[PDB]
Design a protein around this nucleic acid. Structure first.
Lengths: 195, 192
DNA sequence: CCATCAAAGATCTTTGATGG
DNA sequence: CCATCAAAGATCTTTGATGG
């Protein structure tokens, strides 16, 4: 089945414009690489997790593609081996509204992130106040104008590309509210990179 | 701070442990318990030349020793002699019994953080961690966690056994009282 | 009934208070 | 201005709730 549990299959074809995509990366040892992308329709942007590396080229910025038999997990799309992805016909193309492009690249305030439900996937670019390397984890204190929060990565550390002073790019991190002590924690598909 | 007592005191030796390594690069130490006519004292001995002197029921006269909040500490600068008969005496039965008794855990929990704790307790559970070994000990009223993080070698006691503790430190932090190993801590046990 | 992953809690490391 | 050492704080593990 889908890499995201509970994800629902959508057979109906949908045409999107690719806004951005990450390099592929190893998310789990012994498994094929994945990448993250953001795509948009005339009315909505979607975060997308792509598990078929045949599709690297099709996820080029500003390209229009038609996707079918993809999975939807709480608004996050998953494209795996069973999906069909083709280049869109010129007649299937459209203009993405500016507000949608803007929202797709925006990062929520940390204070607002903290109000979301536990388990919500968090994406964004944040200033780093401190980085701490431990044996079983790397932690970051990230911050903005108004607030700060801890980011916890407990996965393989070798391939993280982050340099002192960089802003931190987060993809698919999980909000954990704990009990008034919230953090962002890596999960199965999380990706982290300096900007 | 510990108080130096230059004047001689004659005591009877009640019990003493075998010597053990308490700190890397240091001479061994042992624990003992001794008594006068009127009081018992727990004792820490750091001069191993004195081990034969600390045999059960022996009367010894101690001088230039330290009293550290009720615990006597005997190092190289102390003088320890065999007592003269005229300094010998009878240790009353209630003093000997008090020397051997263990505080209820419910009373231990009320003491100040940092108080040194000794006693014999039933073991309820043992857990081995990466860098510590912990035990749950109990009596008829209460239970408490013991933490050993000094050497990470096997402590071969488990549920049903009895654990004898020497100079463990009470920590109350977080409203969660524990007994924690410290500089001079030692564990003996009775296998089941 | 395993797998998941967040909440709860234990363990481990750092800080800070105290004294000599 | 070392040495202790317990609390605070951070990391790490265990537990418990959910869902295919």
């Amino acid at each position: 089945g889908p890499h995201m549990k509970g994800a629902v299959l959508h057979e109906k074809p949908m045409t999107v414009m690719v806004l951005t995509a990450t390099e592929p990366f190893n998310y789990k040892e012994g498994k094929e690489n994945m990448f993250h992308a953001t795509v948009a329709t005339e009315s909505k942007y979607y975060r997308v997790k792509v598990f078929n590396m045949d599709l690297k080229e099709k996820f080029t910025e500003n390209k229009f593609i038609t996707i079918s038999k993809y999975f939807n997990s709480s608004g996050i799309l998953e494209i795996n081996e069973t999906a069909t992805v083709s280049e869109a016909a010129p007649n299937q193309m459209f203009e993405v509204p500016k507000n949608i492009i803007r929202s797709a690249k925006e990062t929520l305030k940390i204070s607002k992130i903290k109000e979301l439900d536990s388990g919500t996937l968090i994406y964004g670019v944040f200033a780093v106040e401190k980085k701490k390397v431990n044996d079983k984890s790397i932690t970051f204190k990230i911050k903005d104008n108004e607030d700060n929060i801890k980011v916890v990565w407990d996965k393989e550390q070798h391939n993280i590309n982050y340099e002192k002073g960089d802003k931190l790019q987060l993809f698919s991190f999980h909000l954990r509210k704990g009990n008034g002590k919230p953090i962002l924690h890596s999960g199965n598909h999380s990706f982290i990179k300096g900007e």
